[PDB]
Structure 1
Amino acid sequence: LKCHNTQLPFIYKTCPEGKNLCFKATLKKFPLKFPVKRGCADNCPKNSALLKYVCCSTDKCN
């Protein structure tokens, strides 16, 4: 399963071992904001003190 992390350009990669899923997160930076990170996934993250995470199943699903 191949997905996304950089996205700036959609130019992607395949996941690694232990990474059947896909997540992404974002920051409570700006009233509006500019997300955080992404990649593949496994469990389903521990959103933060100041963030959010979400995690899909399918390709580039995050």
Structure 2
Amino acid sequence: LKCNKLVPIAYKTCPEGKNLCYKMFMMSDLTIPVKRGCIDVCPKNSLLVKYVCCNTDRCN
């Protein structure tokens, strides 16, 4: 799938054993995220940073 970088302006495809995109938010997810990348499986959600996975292009 095609995932975006920090800003939802630049994004590409994540073939490297990746078919999902994720975004990590600080404290809360409601607010803007802090980092994001591609992944094959949703990682463990932390209490410090909120984990949000998706399978849609430009989801992050």
Shorter-chain TM-score bucket reads 0.7 to 0.9
**Structure 1 unaligned residues grouped into runs of 5+:** none
RMSD: 2.2
CA positional deviation for 1:16: 3.6
CA positional deviation for 1:6: 2.0
Q: What's the counterpart of residue 41 of structure 1?
A: 39
Question: What are the Cα deviations for residues 6-58 of structure 1, in whole angstroms up to 9, with x where unaligned?
Answer: 21x611222141110111011118xx854221121211021224111011112
**Structure 2 unaligned residues grouped into runs of 5+:** none
Q: What's the counterpart of residue 24 of structure 1?
A: 23
Give the TM-score taking structure 2 as reference length.
Answer: 0.73
SS of alignment partner, residue 13 of structure 1: strand
Q: What's the counterpart of residue 2 of structure 1?
A: 2
Equivalent residues, number: 59
Q: What's the counterpart of residue 61 of structure 1?
A: 59
Segments of 4+ in structure 1 off by > 6 A?
A: none
Report the structure, 1 or 2, having the larger strand content.
2
Greater Rg, structure 1 or structure 2? 1
Q: What's the counterpart of residue 12 of structure 1?
A: 11
Give the TM-score taking structure 1 as reference length.
Answer: 0.72
